[PDB]
Design a protein around this ligand. Structure first.
Ligand SMILES: *[C@@H]1O[C@H](CO)[C@@H](O[C@@H]2O[C@H](CO)[C@@H](O[C@@H]3O[C@H](CO[C@H]4O[C@H](CO[C@H]5O[C@H](CO)[C@@H](O)[C@H](O)[C@@H]5O)[C@@H](O)[C@H](O)[C@@H]4O)[C@@H](O)[C@H](O[C@H]4O[C@H](CO)[C@@H](O)[C@H](O)[C@@H]4O)[C@@H]3O)[C@H](O)[C@H]2NC(C)=O)[C@H](O)[C@H]1NC(C)=O
Ligand SMILES: *[C@@H]1O[C@H](CO)[C@@H](O[C@@H]2O[C@H](CO)[C@@H](O[C@@H]3O[C@H](CO)[C@@H](O)[C@H](O[C@H]4O[C@H](CO)[C@@H](O)[C@H](O)[C@@H]4O)[C@@H]3O)[C@H](O)[C@H]2NC(C)=O)[C@H](O)[C@H]1NC(C)=O
Ligand SMILES: *[C@@H]1O[C@H](CO)[C@@H](O[C@@H]2O[C@H](CO)[C@@H](O[C@@H]3O[C@H](CO)[C@@H](O)[C@H](O)[C@@H]3O)[C@H](O)[C@H]2NC(C)=O)[C@H](O)[C@H]1NC(C)=O
Ligand SMILES: *[C@@H]1O[C@H](CO)[C@@H](O[C@@H]2O[C@H](CO)[C@@H](O[C@@H]3O[C@H](CO)[C@@H](O)[C@H](O)[C@@H]3O)[C@H](O)[C@H]2NC(C)=O)[C@H](O)[C@H]1NC(C)=O
Ligand SMILES: *[C@@H]1O[C@H](CO)[C@@H](O[C@@H]2O[C@H](CO)[C@@H](O[C@@H]3O[C@H](CO)[C@@H](O)[C@H](O)[C@@H]3O)[C@H](O)[C@H]2NC(C)=O)[C@H](O)[C@H]1NC(C)=O
Ligand SMILES: *[C@@H]1O[C@H](CO)[C@@H](O[C@@H]2O[C@H](CO)[C@@H](O[C@@H]3O[C@H](CO)[C@@H](O)[C@H](O)[C@@H]3O)[C@H](O)[C@H]2NC(C)=O)[C@H](O)[C@H]1NC(C)=O
Ligand SMILES: *[C@@H]1O[C@H](CO)[C@@H](O[C@@H]2O[C@H](CO)[C@@H](O[C@@H]3O[C@H](CO)[C@@H](O)[C@H](O)[C@@H]3O)[C@H](O)[C@H]2NC(C)=O)[C@H](O)[C@H]1NC(C)=O
Ligand SMILES: *[C@@H]1O[C@H](CO)[C@@H](O[C@@H]2O[C@H](CO)[C@@H](O[C@@H]3O[C@H](CO)[C@@H](O)[C@H](O)[C@@H]3O)[C@H](O)[C@H]2NC(C)=O)[C@H](O)[C@H]1NC(C)=O
Ligand SMILES: *[C@@H]1O[C@H](CO)[C@@H](O[C@@H]2O[C@H](CO)[C@@H](O[C@@H]3O[C@H](CO)[C@@H](O)[C@H](O)[C@@H]3O)[C@H](O)[C@H]2NC(C)=O)[C@H](O)[C@H]1NC(C)=O
Ligand SMILES: *[C@@H]1O[C@H](CO)[C@@H](O[C@@H]2O[C@H](CO)[C@@H](O[C@@H]3O[C@H](CO)[C@@H](O)[C@H](O)[C@@H]3O)[C@H](O)[C@H]2NC(C)=O)[C@H](O)[C@H]1NC(C)=O
Ligand SMILES: *[C@@H]1O[C@H](CO)[C@@H](O[C@@H]2O[C@H](CO)[C@@H](O[C@@H]3O[C@H](CO)[C@@H](O)[C@H](O)[C@@H]3O)[C@H](O)[C@H]2NC(C)=O)[C@H](O)[C@H]1NC(C)=O
Ligand SMILES: *[C@@H]1O[C@H](CO)[C@@H](O[C@@H]2O[C@H](CO)[C@@H](O)[C@H](O)[C@H]2NC(C)=O)[C@H](O)[C@H]1NC(C)=O
Ligand SMILES: *[C@@H]1O[C@H](CO)[C@@H](O[C@@H]2O[C@H](CO)[C@@H](O)[C@H](O)[C@H]2NC(C)=O)[C@H](O)[C@H]1NC(C)=O
Ligand SMILES: *[C@@H]1O[C@H](CO)[C@@H](O[C@@H]2O[C@H](CO)[C@@H](O)[C@H](O)[C@H]2NC(C)=O)[C@H](O)[C@H]1NC(C)=O
Ligand SMILES: *[C@@H]1O[C@H](CO)[C@@H](O[C@@H]2O[C@H](CO)[C@@H](O)[C@H](O)[C@H]2NC(C)=O)[C@H](O)[C@H]1NC(C)=O
Ligand SMILES: *[C@@H]1O[C@H](CO)[C@@H](O)[C@H](O)[C@H]1NC(C)=O
Ligand SMILES: *[C@@H]1O[C@H](CO)[C@@H](O)[C@H](O)[C@H]1NC(C)=O
Ligand SMILES: *[C@@H]1O[C@H](CO)[C@@H](O)[C@H](O)[C@H]1NC(C)=O
Lengths: 448, 136, 136, 136, 52, 40
């Protein structure tokens, strides 16, 4: 009955698209620590009142593995890692000839009394200096042990940021105007699909930039069951991330007590290295519970019986790899810990203060994380105390080759990606473009 | 009723509250304070590039309402007839059944041809008739 | 009457000339020409970051007038009654006595509750009544 | 009729089609997708600096229409009389003879004095008369 | 435009990481680059150049 | 031809150790200064 075009503005309709996002962070230490590597001096602040508007009757299909927010977090951290330490001391002329012996006692550690040539405050005058460093930082070449540093090969090394916290804080992501982040606060997920109770947020969860392999440290813990993130599962070959229901607390210490040794490379520039270890020679010492973990594993083996066929043979340890890839490599208090994933996969089971559990702990200072073929970073030692106050927020698994059928499908931790580490955080997120213009016909028109 | 708090609800209840969907659309919970001594960091570049894309999505539709005589309000009708070939459903039927959500997926196709026709009957014809009709 | 050249003068004489306060507000004596061979210097960064904050202050209020039917002019009234609890002074009294200066410091508090009410009676109710009233 | 596709044609035929000249003026064939891992290249800087100059040319004239009551449409008249001293040619004569092209080169001089007068008779006088005339 | 100078890949590292790539060894007979052009076509193009 | 069998000192992977290397280059890339041809 006389249909006429009517123009409507502010129509609540979205279109699936990806845009450039930005920071949202609360005031941390404020006085003492002012700029940590991620937040820096000037980070976009967060609002104490987020848009918690839940949309009934909306079953929007979320893409877990094909989310474009994950790739944004990947590029932001590395670009920031290259930026950070740029104005700092270049260790380009530091790499020289290295002659050494072992310790004063025949192995009763993993440190070597090295000697070398370093250009002092004056360029013309050269001084032979002795300094400490951890194992794997140097590689052999030749009565006296004659070797070289691992950096010269691969990349130009620079000294890392002084008094800058290399520990994460809640970094929320804010989408710009005319765009919204769809929040998925749904109970279960089958590796991407249609949801139940889709929400609309302009500010995301307190996502901490996780810097680790094997185990996940911060973040979302979806309750009552362990969530299986499936990028891909039918084919063993692809990586599988698993969200935990309840947190498994993990202590990390380093009873290696080190002093401060500063040697100037040319004019102004100051290089800080490991001084002297006060006390007995000992491993880092992370520590974990025996029974708590067993209890968490209890539902892991039970869930895999439902996902994978029957009770087929399924156990083994991290296969091959370099130190950083196959070990639980993580930042704690400053230094990088390389603890073992062997006592975990030691349990073979089919049918569905605290205890002393530790792993083969090793320290490393030469670190060009995510394979920095341009700018390499030297981790500075931390004088004294080493504490943890961290968590287990998930894990990363792998395949069992390409076996046809069979009864043997042994699974181990072989997840070699940093993107999948934030896929246990951005699983519930999907950016959309808002279309406020709407055209709908109805019995009404305009006149003169 | 909340930002997009009417998207779930039918077109009739969606047209009931559509001002909030445009209110929190620009400076709501995303604007903020917008606070080494330099602002050329990774967060500074990301916020200003997003600001350009923020206005771009508003101005594209803002220009259209301005060239339709619908600029003055949220909801304003036009002197454009509906060609039955585009949609065959009853006016009252989509308003309590189909919802804006599916409805946008129906028009999006002829949407550019609709915008082309909306410009002439309501502005290129109606406002151009005024030139002679204003003084008589 | 000059940029802010009516701020000193009472509300009545301030409402008399308020177009110049919006005229020189954007492209007046601050726009300019906007003229080693590169423009990535300290002055280039400072001018473009200020340009973002320049439109932000205009668009925030520009969107409000657009969702009130007051977009078409400088001064336009609404169909919203004044709750006596907000201000108890006579209409004519503040216009030759209090001045806009002190007056903004009086409303600023309920200003967000005023904006919330201004959206519904004049647009969410008035323009939504048109849907049925336009054709009869 | 095409972007500037009426510039050649006389004022009468130019006023016939002037919506396309404003349609493709912003997001037409220049907007695009706007798609080492960084966007700080020579093309990234050039596109965002051009974006600032893009809105600047639109907003300058957009603010003027907003302070003339002509914001709601493309063509809207005013309550301002034409001082014969500015132009002495017949209304109908320039519309089929002179064309907008030469015509802009004729007004450009008093154009600022014209804009000054356009603000008061149509807004600073007409809309300020409403304050008392709205309720009677 | 050709260059029948057939060169191998020689990489010498300058300090840490940095790699410098230079001309290796020329395989075959010693010869000039060799661009080549037509005789008559050009003459024909020059024909209208001198006339203009 | 127009190539010259040049010798020179280039700092290898290690800064302290120096290795004398031989590499090719085209004509005009070097200019004379001084039995053996000595240039820059
Ligand atoms: C998920 O994200 C969270 C983010 O909050 C991760 O949190 C981990 O928290 C622990 C425990 O706090 C961190 O270690 C320490 O944090 C201390 C906080 O110190 C504040 O108050 C100080 C007062 O000083 C006195 O008490 C402290 C108590 O630790 C003593 O150490 C100190 O000697 C004094 O007795 C202030 O001075 C201080 O600046 C803070 O305001 C820090 O004190 C301590 O830092 C030491 O070294 C700092 C280096 O800059 C230095 O600035 C400090 O002054 C101090 O000497 C230390 O950092 C973990 O580092 C932190 N990160 C991680 C990755 O574990 C959480 O772990 C994360 N991960 C999950 C869940 O897996
Ligand atoms: C996770 O990723 C897997 C990828 O494998 C995906 O499922 C795969 O789907 C394809 C569909 O074409 C399956 O392909 C066939 O499966 C049958 C039954 O076993 C085989 O007989 C077929 O043999 C072919 O390939 C052989 C090897 O080249 C050839 O020799 C032969 O001539 C045939 O061309 C073929 O494999 C494929 O098997 C599955 N993968 C499985 C079942 O493991 C899966 O959808 C993803 N899952 C999700 C959503 O999590
Ligand atoms: C490696 O370990 C050796 C330990 O043998 C460190 O160097 C040694 O340092 C001691 C004390 O600092 C020197 O002994 C004393 O020197 C003083 C003053 O010069 C003198 O008066 C005393 O009579 C006594 O000789 C000792 O000579 C020195 N070793 C040598 C041969 O010079 C070394 O610094 C450590 N560095 C690393 C980590 O490689
Ligand atoms: C998460 O879990 C759900 C529930 O199982 C997944 O849904 C399943 O989707 C597949 C295709 O993606 C369906 O397969 C096809 O079903 C049709 C029905 O006619 C059949 O004809 C085909 O031969 C085929 O079997 C499947 O039926 C469906 N679930 C059921 C009821 O079995 C969902 O895709 C999961 N997410 C992912 C992608 O891991
Ligand atoms: C526009 O209205 C027309 C005309 O009513 C629609 O075209 C055709 O409409 C007939 C209605 O009788 C459809 O027939 C239907 O057949 C199905 C299946 O056999 C039956 O279940 C229904 O009861 C009905 O008899 C016919 O499919 C439809 N043709 C097509 C393909 O469009 C027209 O579709 C309407 N709008 C659109 C989407 O263009
Ligand atoms: C325009 O009107 C059409 C009429 O249905 C709407 O849908 C059209 O649907 C067909 C079949 O689904 C589309 O074919 C496509 O083929 C690609 C091949 O890769 C496949 O990926 C798609 O899933 C789909 O099957 C066709 O492109 C599509 N459009 C047209 C113009 O015929 C369509 O939604 C309406 N709106 C728009 C935005 O064009
Ligand atoms: C809104 O109007 C009301 C009611 O007229 C104001 O509330 C109260 O008004 C009485 C008026 O008699 C004020 O009493 C005054 O007392 C002073 C000091 O003793 C005296 O000098 C005056 O002649 C008058 O008698 C009373 O203070 C006032 N109460 C308060 C605290 O508000 C009301 O204030 C007006 N507007 C506002 C600001 O809400
Ligand atoms: C909202 O209405 C109130 C009503 O008077 C206006 O003023 C209020 O005044 C009191 C007392 O002056 C404020 O207390 C403040 O305490 C801080 C403590 O640091 C002190 O620094 C201030 O000088 C002041 O004494 C109170 O915050 C203030 N607001 C409210 C909501 O009660 C106020 O101007 C009106 N407008 C706004 C913008 O809220
Ligand atoms: C505004 O209208 C006036 C008055 O009609 C124009 O001023 C003067 O108008 C006379 C018209 O008779 C012009 O005289 C002309 O002289 C030429 C050359 O001798 C002759 O060919 C014409 O037939 C006519 O007689 C006179 O030049 C003109 N004066 C000037 C210098 O302006 C006036 O020009 C019109 N508009 C403008 C541009 O201000
Ligand atoms: C303002 O009205 C005048 C009235 O004709 C329009 O033109 C004016 O023309 C004279 C003579 O052509 C201008 O003199 C200029 O001298 C410079 C010296 O370098 C020369 O380069 C120019 O070619 C020209 O001869 C005069 O500046 C000009 N303006 C005024 C105000 O007298 C003029 O187009 C009208 N519009 C504007 C934008 O002012
Ligand atoms: C310049 O051209 C000369 C060619 O004479 C290049 O150096 C010469 O390279 C050959 C073979 O690579 C050396 O001869 C052989 O060395 C082996 C192993 O060391 C030995 O077992 C054989 O008996 C034989 O001596 C030759 O000695 C060497 N010349 C010298 C004097 O060292 C040179 O690399 C070219 N580089 C440029 C472009 O300047
Ligand atoms: C630093 O430079 C000194 C310069 O004297 C080195 O001492 C010589 O080392 C070489 C072998 O590396 C021996 O052939 C010489 O006989 C040494 N001279 C003396 C005094 O005995 C010193 O080893 C250099 N240190 C490093 C490892 O760079
Ligand atoms: C999923 O549905 C649930 C209810 O079924 C929503 O849960 C509530 O969310 C509000 C947000 O403010 C909380 O205040 C309530 O406490 C939550 N209820 C509880 C205890 O579950 C939930 O928000 C929905 N999902 C999304 C996407 O937000
Ligand atoms: C490592 O152990 C030593 C051994 O006690 C600690 O040394 C003390 O340091 C304080 C700092 O001012 C001195 O006042 C004490 O006299 C030191 N004691 C002795 C005898 O060395 C040292 O503090 C420990 N680690 C760090 C880095 O704090
Ligand atoms: C590279 O360094 C070596 C160091 O031995 C040079 O060999 C000497 O060259 C100088 C003149 O340039 C002679 O006076 C010496 O007698 C040479 N020593 C020997 C072993 O005979 C070598 O020429 C340097 N190469 C260049 C060109 O840089
Ligand atoms: C060290 O760098 C050199 C330079 O090519 C390389 O040949 C060597 O294999 C590297 N390190 C190893 C694998 O020992
Ligand atoms: C390890 O951390 C847990 C959690 O605080 C704590 O209860 C336990 O006592 C710690 N280990 C030691 C030193 O006993
Ligand atoms: C309502 O919309 C749905 C969308 O598919 C459609 O199937 C149904 O027939 C519609 N009902 C009517 C006639 O309004």
């Amino acid at each position: 009955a006389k249909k006429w075009v009517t123009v409507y503005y502010g129509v609540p309709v979205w279109k699936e698209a990806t845009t450039t996002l930005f920071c949202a962070s609360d005031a941390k230490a404020y006085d003492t620590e002012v700029h940590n590597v991620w937040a820096t001096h000037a980070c976009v602040p967060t609002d104490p009142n987020p848009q918690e508007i839940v949309l009934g009757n909306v079953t929007e299909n979320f893409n877990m593995w094909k989310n474009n927010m994950v790739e944004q977090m990947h590029e932001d951290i590395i670009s920031l890692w290259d930026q950070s330490l740029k104005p700092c001391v270049k260790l380009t002329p530091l790499c020289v000839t290295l002659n050494c012996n072992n310790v004063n006692t025949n192995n009763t550690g993993e440190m070597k009394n090295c000697s070398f040539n370093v250009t002092t405050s004056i360029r013309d005058k050269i001084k032979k200096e002795y300094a400490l460093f951890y194992k794997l930082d140097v590689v052999p070449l030749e009565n006296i042990t004659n070797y070289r540093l691992i950096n010269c090969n691969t990349s130009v090394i620079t000294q890392a940021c002084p008094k800058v916290s290399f520990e994460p804080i809640p970094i929320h992501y804010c989408a710009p105007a005319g765009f919204a982040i769809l929040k998925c606060n749904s109970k279960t997920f089958n590796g991407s699909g249609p949801c139940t109770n889709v929400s609309t947020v302009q500010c995301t969860h307190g996502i901490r930039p996780v810097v680790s392999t094997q185990l996940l440290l911060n973040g979302s813990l979806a309750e009552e069951e362990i969530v299986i993130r499936s990028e891909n599962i039918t084919d063993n070959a692809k990586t599988i991330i698993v969200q935990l229901n309840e947190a498994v607390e993990i202590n990390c210490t380093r009873p290696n007590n080190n002093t401060r040794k500063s040697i100037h490379i040319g004019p102004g520039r100051a290089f800080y290295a490991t001084g002297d270890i006060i006390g007995n020679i000992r491993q880092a010492h992370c520590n974990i519970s025996k029974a708590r973990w067993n209890e968490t594993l209890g539902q892991i083996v039970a869930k895999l019986e439902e996902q994978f066929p029957n009770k087929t043979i399924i156990f083994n340890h991290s296969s091959g790899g370099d130190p950083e890839i196959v070990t639980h490599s993580f930042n704690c208090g400053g230094e990088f810990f390389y603890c073992n994933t062997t006592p975990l996969f030691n349990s073979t089971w089919n049918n569905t203060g605290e205890q002393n559990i530790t792993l083969q702990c090793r320290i490393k200072q030469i670190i060009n994380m995510w394979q920095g073929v341009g700018k390499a970073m030297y981790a500075p030692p931390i004088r004294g105390q080493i504490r943890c106050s961290s968590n287990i927020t998930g894990l990363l698994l792998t395949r069992d080759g390409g076996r046809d059928q069979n009864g043997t499908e042994t699974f181990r931790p072989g997840g070699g990606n940093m993107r999948d580490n934030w896929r246990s955080e951005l699983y519930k997120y999907k950016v959309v473009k808002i279309e406020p213009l709407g055209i709908a016909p109805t019995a009404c028109k305009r006149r003169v | 009723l909340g930002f997009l708090g009417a998207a779930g609800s039918t077109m009739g209840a969606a047209s009931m509250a559509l001002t909030v969907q445009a209110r929190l659309l620009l400076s709501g919970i995303v604007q903020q304070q917008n606070n080494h001594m330099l602002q050329l960091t990774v967060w500074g570049i990301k916020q200003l590039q997003a600001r350009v894309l923020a206005v771009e999505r508003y101005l594209r539709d803002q220009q259209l309402l301005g060239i339709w005589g619908c600029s003055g309000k949220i909801i304003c009708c036009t002197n454009v007839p509906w060609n039955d070939s585009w949609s065959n459903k009853t006016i009252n039927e989509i308003w309590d059944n189909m919802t804006w959500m599916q409805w946008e997926k129906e028009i999006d196709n002829y949407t550019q041809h609709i915008y082309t026709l909306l410009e002439v009957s309501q502005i290129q014809q109606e406002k151009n008739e005024q030139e002679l009709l204003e003084l008589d």
